[PDB]
Structures are given as C-alpha cells and as structure tokens.
Design a protein around this ligand. Structure first.
Ligand SMILES: Nc1nc2c(ncn2[C@@H]2O[C@H](COP(=O)(O)O)[C@@H](O)[C@H]2O)c(=O)[nH]1
Ligand SMILES: Nc1nc2c(ncn2[C@@H]2O[C@H](COP(=O)(O)O)[C@@H](O)[C@H]2O)c(=O)[nH]1
Ligand SMILES: Nc1nc2c(ncn2[C@@H]2O[C@H](COP(=O)(O)O)[C@@H](O)[C@H]2O)c(=O)[nH]1
Ligand SMILES: Nc1nc2c(ncn2[C@@H]2O[C@H](COP(=O)(O)O)[C@@H](O)[C@H]2O)c(=O)[nH]1
Ligand SMILES: Nc1nc2c(ncn2[C@@H]2O[C@H](COP(=O)(O)O)[C@@H](O)[C@H]2O)c(=O)[nH]1
Ligand SMILES: Nc1nc2c(ncn2[C@@H]2O[C@H](COP(=O)(O)O)[C@@H](O)[C@H]2O)c(=O)[nH]1
Lengths: 467, 467, 467
C-alpha cells in the first residue's frame, strides 16, 4: 500500500500508529459510496461478527445479516442448535426485525429480562398468533415481579400491514408514544416489529442475502476431529459460509483441514486463519482457501501476547497478508484489535477484503449473553474468549490438558446508555468507513485500497482530536 | 537472531518492545515439545530461582527441583545452613511433596502460620512418625489461638502407599473432601503428601535429578574474600551447580574468581555474571566459565538504573550475549526483568540457554519469607534486594561502607488469591513457553532459537490483547 | 394488673416504659408452658398476622396456621382471591410445608426469584405430579438466566413417604447435603417438603385447626359499603374468623357494622377495632363483638400520631381495655407497636388475650411482597400501610377524597441474613413468651395475666442489657 515519503519505520505498526492522509475527492456525500465486499462472502457492509460464543447468536446473526454483514456461528456447537439457528435466521423478514414475542402467561420478571434481548425497547404480548399488547420499562416497573403479563397494563401499539414502505411507517411513528410499530401479516398474524430508526435504516443498508433471498449466515469449525465430516454436515445444515478457525493457522493440521474441505467441493467460500505472515497466507491459499483470517494476538480477548510473546501488530500483518493474497488472488479478513471505527477503516485501507469485529459487539443488546448490571447501574455484558474452542486437541487426560490450557479470559464490555444496540454500533462503523471513503475520495472498497495513502504517527499523534 | 525485514531500531529493545512472529508449525500440541535445557545445568524446564534470600529457600529448592528447574542458594549464607538445606533437598521424594509436618504438641497459632508454608492447603499432624490427622483453614478457624493441635478436630485423610501411580491417587482424590493425600512408607511411617494437581503435574514435568537421582540444587558465592575456598567447600557440601554473582560481572575481581574456581577443577558447571556486553561474555568464557548470567539493571529489585544510569534493556543484551557465547561455545542465562511468561519466552527466543525468575517467585507460598497480609486482606510477601551480597567489599569502616551502599529495596509481591503456589506460576510459565514453541513450530529449545523470527513493536503495540 | 408499690406514673406507658418483675416460679422449662389462647380464635400461639396486604398472604396464612397462629386476610380484597386463598390454605398438610413447585419448562430467572418465596432454601422441580429435581442458590447461580430449569443440573433429594414421624425424617436429614426432604404421597405424587428445623418445629408447635382439622384462617372487612353482605359472603367463603377493622373503632359506623354482623348470627367470633379507651371497648362489646382490637397509632406503619396527635401509648391502652373487656367478659387483641418479643410478652402481660404482629412479619420470606435487595445486598422488603382500606369512605370525587387521604407510607423491613423466615421470628417470639412465663412462674396465659407484676422504668432503664 502507498505510504508517505520517508516513512519506513523499523517496527510493525498497529492501528494507533497509522493514519490516512485525505486526497483529492470526488465523492460528494457518505451515501455516495457503497460498502459491498468483493471477497464473495456477500456482505454489503465490511463487518463480520466473530465466531465467539459470547458474540455470535441467532439474534445477532439475523440483525447483522439484515444490516448487510455476515455472522460466523461459534465453533464446537451442537449441530442441532446450528440447524435451529440457521432455520430461524433464514425465516426472517428482510426488512422487519423479529421482536420479543411474549405469551400472555409469562411472568413480569421474564418480560422485564426479555425486554433487553432486543434494541427495540418494547416487547410484544401476542395471543394465538395475534398481537394484543406492548410492554416496556415503564409499565413493567412497580408491578409485582411474578404477576402475569396479561395484567401488566398492556399499552396500545401502531399496527401496519407487511409491505408498507418505510416512509409510511416512519410518518406513522412521528408522534407515536412507543417508537416501535407492529408489522402484521395479511391474515392478521404478527410478522414482526419495525422501529423508527429501523425504518430509517431499512433504506440505507441493503440486507445481505443468498441466491434464494434469505439472510446470509456462516458457521465455524475447528481442526481437532474429523474436519471434513463436520464441514459437510454444516454445509448441509444451510450455512452459507464456512470458517475454519484455530489459534495458529500455519500448522500442518490447518493445511490438512483446508485440503479436506476443498476436496469436499462444497461450493461455499473458504475461510481459514489465523496467519500473520505472508508465507502463512500463501500456504493457506495453496491449501484451497479463498479467504484468509489474519491476526493472532490483537484480539481484545486474546492472551497469547502476554503469555507467549507471539503475535504481530494488526495493521502491518493485515497489509502484508493482503498484499500476498492479492498477489495470489486471495482475499483477507482482518480479525482482532477492533475497538473504534478507525480500526475498521484502517483495516480496510491496509488491503483487507473485510474486517471482523469480535468482542466489541459483545457489549450490545443482541449479543448471546446475559445483560448484567454493575454497582453504578451502568449496563454491561461479559465477553469470554474461545480458549480451547480455538485450540488444537478420561478424567486424567481431561484435567491434564486443562491444566496447561489458557484460561477463559473475561472482560466487561459496557453498554452505551443510549445507543446500546448493535444497530447503532454498525451505524457508527459504517459512518466512519463512509467518511474515510469520502476523505480518500473512493467510490468503493477496492478504490479505497487503491487510492489510500497512509502515514506513520507517534504516541503524541494519537492524542490529537476529541477522544 | 532472525528479525523482520526493515527492522533495525536505533535503540536496545526490551521484552515489551519485541514480539515473535509465528511460522510454519509441525508441533501438534504443547505436550509435544520438550523444555530440557542444553546448558548442562540439567533443568528440564527453563526456569531458575534467583540467588535471592527472599526467593531461594529449602522449600522452593525442593519444589522447583521436583518440577524440573534448578534453584541457586543465596550467597553469603552460613555453610552449615547450606549443608542442612542440601541434605534436606537431596532426601526428598522425586514425586511426593514434603508436607507441613505438625507435632501434636504444637499450638493452633503455629499450625495456622505453618499452613501457608506450602501450597497444599493442609498440614499433617503426625505422631511418632505416623500421620494421625489433617488440619486446614476451616477446622483451625474459630478455635482458641493457643489451644493444642491435638484438640483442633483433626479430619480424616486419604492414605495411600508410596509407589502408587498418579492415576490411582488421582481417582482416589476425585471426591475427597481434602485435596491432599498422604503417601505413607511401607512400614507405615509418613513419607509425604501428594495433591490432586500434584498428581496431575507428576506426569507432565520430569524432575531434575543428578547422576545419583537426587533433586538438583545450586548455590552462589560472591567475589569478596577467598572465592576458591568457598567454592570448594560448597562443592563438597553437595551443591550440583556453582553460581558466582556480583553487581558488575566484567571487573577484574570477577575474572580472578572465575579463574580460581576453574583451576580448582571441581567438575561442576560454571556460572558467572552479570555482563550485558559481548566483550564481557568473551572475557567470562575465556576465564573458565561455561554459563554466563546476563542482565544488570532489569531486575525488579535492581536500583542501579535509577541511581547510576547504568544497565541495558534486557532483550538486546540477552540476544547479543547469547550470540557471543554461542560463537565461543558458551551458554547464557537471562537474569532480571521477568514478570510475565512472555518475558521467559522472549529470553529463550533471544538465544539464552535458560532464564532466571527472581522476585516474581518471591510472591509464592514456598518462598523463604513471611506471608504478610495487607489491609484489604489480599495475601502478599515482601521481596528484598541482595544489595551488599551482590557487591564487592571496625564500626567506623562498617558504617562508612554502609553509608554509600545502596539500600535494601523492598517490594510487595501480591499472592494470587487462587493460584498462589509456585507450582501454578511454573505451570503458567511452562504453558507460555510451550505455546511459543508451537507458534514458532519448534520441537525443542535449540529449535526455538533457530526457527524464531522476532519483530519490533511500538508502545501501542503492547496494548493489543487482554492484559 | 398488679404494679409495684409506689408506681403511679402521671403518663400512659408504652412497652419500653414497663418491665416484668420475676416472681416465685414452679415452671421448670419453657416447654412446660402452653401458649393456647382463650379468646376463642383457636390459636395455639399468641401471634396474629395483621390484615395488611403487605404481610397477609396465602403463604404466610398457611405457615402461621401450621405453627399455631391465625392470619387475618387483608380487607378490600376480591372475594374470588379470598376463596382461592382459603381453599389453598384449608388443603395444606398439618405437618408438611408446601414447597415452591417448579414446572420443568420454567426459566432459570423464575426459579431463582421463586426460591425466596419460602424459607426452605430449595425449590422442587416436579414433572407430571412426581418430584424429579431440586434447585437452590448454588446450582442456579452462574447458568444463563433464561435457560430452562430442566437443564439447571438438578440435584438429588431425600424422599420419604407422608406419615413418617419427624424423628425419622430428622435423622434422615442429619448428613443430607440439602436440608429439605420431599414428603411424597403413597401413590408417589409429591405432597410437600419438610425441613430439618421444620421436623424440629413439628413437635414443639401444635397447628391451629378448626373443627374439621384444617388450618384456621381469618379475613377482614371494612365499614364502608354493605358490611353485612360482605361478612356473610366471607363466612360462606370458609373464613374461620371475621375481623372488622377501621382507623377509628369508636365511631357510630363501627357500632352499626358490629350490630349487623352480630344480627347475622354467623357463628364465627367477632373482632372489632381499634379503640384505645375503656368506653370504646364497652361500646364494642355491647355492639355484639367478642374480641376487641386495641391500638391506634403505635403501628409501625401508622402515621396518625404525627399528622393528628391522636393515639395512645400501647401498653396503657392495652391494659385498660383488657380490664374493661374482662369486666364485661370480652377479650382483647393488642395491635401495633410490636418490634421485639418483649412487646408481645408485655402485651400478653397487660391482659390482652392475643397480640397481632403487623409489619414486623412483612420482613420475612413468606410475606406477600417482592424480596428486593439494597445496595449493600442486604435482603429486605417493603412494608406499606393500609391507608384508605382502614378508613371510612367519578374522577372529581375520587381525586378530591384522595387529596386529603393519608399517603400509603412505606418502610424498609430488613431480612435477617440467616434467620429470615417467619418460622424463626415465630420461634423468637414464642421463646420470649415462654421465658416470660417461666420468670413469672405461670403455666398458661391466664396465669400469666394473673401472676404478672409490672414496674415502671425510665429512659436509662431501657439501656440495661444487650440490645
Ligand atoms: N418468551 C420468549 N423468550 C424468548 C424470546 N426470544 C428469546 N427468548 C429467550 O431467550 C432464549 C434464547 O436466547 P438467545 O440465544 O436468543 O439470546 C430462549 O430459549 C428464550 O428463553 C421471545 O421472543 N419470547
Ligand atoms: N488466542 C485466543 N484468541 C481468542 C480467544 N477468544 C477470541 N480470540 C480471537 O480474538 C478475536 C476477537 O477479538 P476482538 O476482535 O474482539 O478484539 C476472535 O475472533 C479470535 O480470533 C481466546 O480465548 N484465545
Ligand atoms: N513444625 C514444623 N515447622 C516447620 C515445618 N516446615 C517449616 N517449619 C518452620 O519453618 C522454619 C523454616 O522456614 P523455611 O526456611 O523452610 O521457610 C523451621 O525452622 C520451622 O520453624 C514443618 O513441617 N513443621
Ligand atoms: N543491583 C542489584 N541487583 C539486584 C539486587 N537484588 C537482586 N538483584 C538482581 O535482580 C535479579 C532478580 O530480579 P528479577 O528477576 O526478580 O526482576 C537477581 O537475580 C539479581 O541479578 C540488588 O539489591 N541490587
Ligand atoms: N411456578 C410457581 N409459581 C409459584 C409458586 N408459589 C408461588 N408462585 C408464584 O407466586 C404467585 C403468588 O404469590 P404469593 O401471593 O403466593 O406471594 C403465583 O401466581 C406464582 O406466580 C410455585 O410453587 N410455583
Ligand atoms: N392509621 C393507619 N394504621 C395503619 C396503617 N397500616 C397499618 N395500620 C395499623 O398498624 C398495624 C400494624 O402495625 P405494626 O403492628 O406492624 O406496628 C395494623 O394492623 C393496623 O392496625 C395505615 O396506613 N394507617
């Protein structure tokens, strides 16, 4: 990638150590740039939710797929749950979000705990398939925790049929006391709930769909055990994309797994990682992988940097691997070390065909975890590492292996008190990437890579601007 | 050592300034790599406990020797105590740990204070050489501090003969209320205590033993006074390895001491330090030393960096000295600046034949110190510097020398509330080194040095990953 | 009642202002005295749970009725709920407590919130009427809040048939990991759960039962509206005792209500209040009431003392009214101002045929409220006053009446961290009353009244003893 004159630092650079120099721009507005990825994963935004059990669930899968990004299901997961999640996601409206359906016999405690499963802020009490009420934080508060939800003073909702343009439902919700509105099927059954900002987003983002027009989804497999059988069963389960993940993506087991999956000829794009070296990417590409995950160590839950000293600063690894893959025709997914939208913008600028968010999305409403509360009542969630799920594998043998195994690290990802949903994190990331495109003057991601110029900055250079 | 292309920093690098780039790996698991050292010290793990009076004791000596690492006894120690410690260590079971033996006439206060001498969490009340009870933090609490230990409501213990495989004692302790189990001699006398995790570790680690199959131990001498007589008496005392330590290992006194010890022809491997220069290592090797300690200043208790400005970043000194020693056939021990297992992994990667832990192990159960408690009740221990014990030497003369002498610095090394024993610190270090081997793809430490590739990282590069 | 010589204070005395002087005693132990009441309410202990919606529920009703005390259902309650509660209570085992029955399809959050409904500390997961598991605070913690209770790692329980003596189940639970044991019906269906301390209490307390051997229960009616119809419907609903409660029990409306209920000839004992004057008790007795509630103002939730200045110190009012009622043959229930068992003992000593606890029992596991948690995580519950439910009665009229109406006062009754159940509060109260009987030397409550001698004490007199 192009660098400023005289910029040959004697160290690998991270995201905080680099910056983008704006160039001559012809892109008028942020909406004039398209974020469609070229990697073949079919994501209209360069965002992938990581294959972490704390960040990858059915709700996040459907939400991000509707917003145009693919979601990788966590590895080492019972294929029954995988099939259930895939069937759930593929049966979702391309525009309307699936609400928190509440049976009239549910308790107040269950309703209150479920209200935070989604970012809508309200839950639908539905009887016999017909929506009969709405609950929120207001009517639920004060009443007894174990009273039935049929006696929670159900509020009135704005009902509209499925197929009305986002304009009409938007103006319908201009003065609505409750932001959400129930999209009902023509027969009268509830089909979903659409929000004011959801109506806004329905036009900006184009949902990522497969050849059959269903929300794309992905799943991950390890290398321990029969990789071929697991990958084949995953492909038959309906997963659009297969991701083979391990702590070290340059070992012979990784190459054998990629070779087996490629020989299976499943037709789905191939994703392997992680390698932070050009030779590792070359080996993975020659092994039969179309997409290469890059980054071992920058992950916010990754510990190997402190325990082993291995790793690489994310930006330099991403740019070198992207150069290698583009030399061999392959494509690159940056993984780990993403905490600000500048990280996404720089990862795409370095040459990566896509970026993968990880534990940042764990601090969202839709992450498959428990929304706990701290002492100061600030919302947050616990993010865990994959640990043995990303590692190559009687009571004695189990405990002996577990003694030397890296512990499951835990972190507290705080929720935004106002913009807590993953919708708003995606909005921030996409706005940052669009602004980067406008500053560079690129109409698309390949043009972003081609026309970006990057400079090096010191520690004090990062202090410039408002945090 | 191999470095990334374009990495020629204009400054000496420390451990935080370098990282290991993973390469093509054929090592399947962490257990597939052996950590046996080539230096001739006969340690099966690359860990040496420093010659500090706050970190080197009989308990740490026997524990680390059983786990495969050598321990250097502190210098300026009465040879009577040295002989007692060496005889104690050489008379230890290669598998079973020596417990806290409690006579029935001991007080409750003594039992409670002794319970934290070892990591077992329980102490054995033994009468006439026969184990009769077990005490822990539960039964001891609440009872009067000065009641006899024969009335502390002794609990029941799992008794097994010496020679049962760790499998059998492991399954015997699966549902045991007390984790420890008493290994008894065939005549019925108590021979030791083995723990559940001790049973686990008995197979993973191979104890470091001499030609007679006894736990290896080492001792240290200074340069002031007759070095030859002290070294000869130490060799006759039973010490396997001799370490000659001083603040400045490049002075003429150091060379004279090494020359005298080499002329003694004691047969034990020779260890001298510290020098952070290639010429210093060359002089030490030519003086008759097989192993060279490197690092003056990076020590967590070392003050000379702030008082004098002398020293060197540990990683660059280690790699340069290792290159010099391997040119002359000598071998290198990194000393100081070890706080994370990444430090050990990088020290071995730089070319050092071994690493020496130091004050990190002072915050353990087995360190020869007093387990004090802070206000927040978090366990911790006080680590002190060697000071004049590592420096070259009437009331007037004594006080005059002491006025200019560096004060004995003190630090508070906190105990891990759960994994406080040195067994678990060794587990963490060994797991980190094994993971580094797998990431590099090395089957042994020489292969680790040969096949490692190191890059340079900025300050923000160290922030990547979970702390 | 007898007083010490020279004790003629010029002020009405409260419980803190009086004390009992022990006399010549022939009662050997506390178990040698019986606490059976003479008032005809058929309570074997002198404890009545108040007609407060925050303290009177089905769980408290059944528990206190099994322990020998009657419970007055709150007034202004839908007779459908009254009938449901009465049928639930009358269908309870005289020895075994009804546990927290958990269907296998309940969520983890519901199970955790339900676990604190009873004092057993464990909940029974029952399938098809057959107990299949037990949950507690241990197995529930850590697992996902919305996982099904069929996957909460159900524990094993001690199963015994219904009819085994408390001795056998007591010894069965001597070493049981879970204190509770499931009493199962002969056909195998679950009939209840009995605890270790429940087995202990099954012999000490004799359950209060009606002529048909069913747990006695009581209900309350106001004076506004048709008192006769409400009282008759309550009697047909199965309530054993009728309590007519109002803020001022000396008004003409109170007398008319008592006259109507007496003319109804329902056969149940008559309870009216509150009057703190001898003339008020005389009027209530002549109106057709057998039992008179005494005390307006001492109630821990009562506010009229601060707002209006009306009221009376509880002890003097109780003793004067008891003297008047015993002159006319009526009987007295002390109400309000009970916070320590000394209050109960003094109320019975003053001459009251019974005492009524009130908001003290609101801070229990079985109180019909929500067990909330404070910042320091100390358990507690919110106690509310009856307000308009104890007061004599369009939007304009409603708001106009509510403007001048006393607000529903709220108090925080803290739970005992260990002895939080109402079983243990009853144990404390009964132990205090039994000890008072032994100190006086009385074999029964009438003997307590006859043989008690009371003295007056100053403010500093109350400081004597351990708080
Ligand atoms: N009643 C109800 N529970 C829901 C709904 N969505 C999620 N849940 C709860 O959340 C669980 C799955 O959590 P997830 O994996 O989707 O974060 C379900 O098994 C169920 O307990 C909903 O619409 N209604
Ligand atoms: N070595 C290691 N990497 C992990 C673990 N958990 C997650 N990761 C890596 O870190 C990524 C997420 O980090 P993030 O992008 O949130 O900073 C994952 O996609 C995965 O590549 C773990 O336990 N160990
Ligand atoms: N009674 C008793 N004291 C012990 C035992 N192990 C260590 N100690 C105490 O610890 C002292 C030595 O401490 P160390 O140098 O081993 O940390 C001994 O002199 C003795 O007071 C043991 O097994 N039993
Ligand atoms: N100059 C100096 N070095 C010390 C002193 N105490 C320990 N050291 C050095 O620091 C090492 C331990 O440091 P650590 O490895 O714990 O950071 C020792 O092995 C020794 O080389 C002291 O008082 N002065
Ligand atoms: N599932 C279940 N809910 C119970 C049980 N006992 C009480 N509850 C809950 O508590 C409510 C009544 O509370 P209460 O008035 O008894 O304090 C019920 O409607 C129900 O929601 C029980 O055994 N099982
Ligand atoms: N005036 C008045 N008395 C109340 C109210 N709530 C409860 N009480 C009285 O206070 C009694 C309970 O008080 P405690 O016995 O807990 O101190 C009740 O039985 C009733 O007599 C209220 O809101 N106003």
């Amino acid at each position: 990638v192009r660098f400023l004159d005289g910029h040959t630092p004697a160290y690998d650079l991270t995201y905080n150590d680099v910056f983008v120099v704006p160039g001559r721009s012809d892109v008028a507005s942020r909406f004039d740039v398209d974020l469609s990825t070229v990697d073949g994963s079919g994501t209209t935004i360069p965002v992938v939710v990581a294959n972490m059990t704390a960040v990858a669930g059915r709700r996040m899968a459907e939400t991000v797929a509707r917003r145009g990004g693919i979601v990788v299901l966590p590895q080492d997961l019972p294929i029954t749950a995988v099939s259930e999640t895939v069937d759930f996601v593929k049966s979702r409206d391309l525009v309307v979000d699936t609400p928190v359906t509440l049976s009239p016999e549910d308790s107040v405690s269950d309703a209150n705990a479920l209200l935070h499963k989604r970012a809508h802020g309200a839950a639908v009490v539905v009887f016999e398939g017909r929506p009969i009420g709405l609950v929120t934080e207001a009517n639920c508060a004060g009443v007894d925790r174990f009273a039935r939800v049929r006696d929670i003073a159900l509020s009135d909702f704005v009902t509209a049929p499925v197929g009305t343009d986002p304009r009409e439902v938007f103006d319908l919700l201009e003065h609505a006391p409750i932001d959400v509105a129930v999209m009902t099927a023509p027969d009268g059954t509830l089909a979903g709930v659409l929000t004011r900002t959801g109506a806004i987003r329905a036009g900006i983002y184009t949902p990522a769909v497969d050849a059959k027009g269903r929300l794309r989804i992905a799943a991950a497999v390890g290398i321990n055990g029969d990789v071929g059988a697991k990958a084949q069963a995953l492909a038959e389960a309906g997963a659009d994309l297969l991701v083979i993940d391990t702590a070290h993506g340059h070992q012979a087991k990784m190459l054998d797994a990629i070779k087996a999956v490629a020989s299976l000829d499943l037709g789905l794009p191939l994703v392997a990682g992680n390698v932070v070296s050009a030779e590792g990417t070359r080996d993975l590409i020659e092994a039969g992988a179309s997409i290469v995950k890059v980054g071992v160590g920058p992950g916010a839950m990754c510990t190997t940097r402190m325990m082993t000293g291995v790793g690489r600063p994310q930006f330099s690894a991403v740019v070198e691997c992207a150069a290698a893959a583009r030399q061999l025709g392959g494509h690159v997914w940056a993984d780990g070390g993403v905490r600000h939208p500048r990280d996404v913008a720089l990862a795409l600028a370095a040459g990566a065909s896509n970026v993968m968010i990880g534990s940042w999305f764990a601090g969202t409403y839709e992450s498959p975890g428990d929304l706990l509360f701290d002492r100061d009542d600030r919302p947050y969630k616990e993010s865990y590492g994959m640990a043995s799920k990303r590692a190559v594998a009687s009571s004695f043998d189990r405990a002996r292996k577990g003694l030397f195994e890296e512990g499951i690290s835990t972190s507290r990802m705080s929720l935004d008190p106002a913009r807590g949903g993953v919708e708003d994190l995606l909005d921030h990331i996409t706005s940052g990437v669009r602004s980067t495109c406008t500053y560079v003057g690129a109409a698309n991601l390949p043009e972003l890579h081609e026309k970006v110029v990057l400079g090096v900055q010191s520690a004090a250079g990062f202090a410039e601007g408002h945090p």
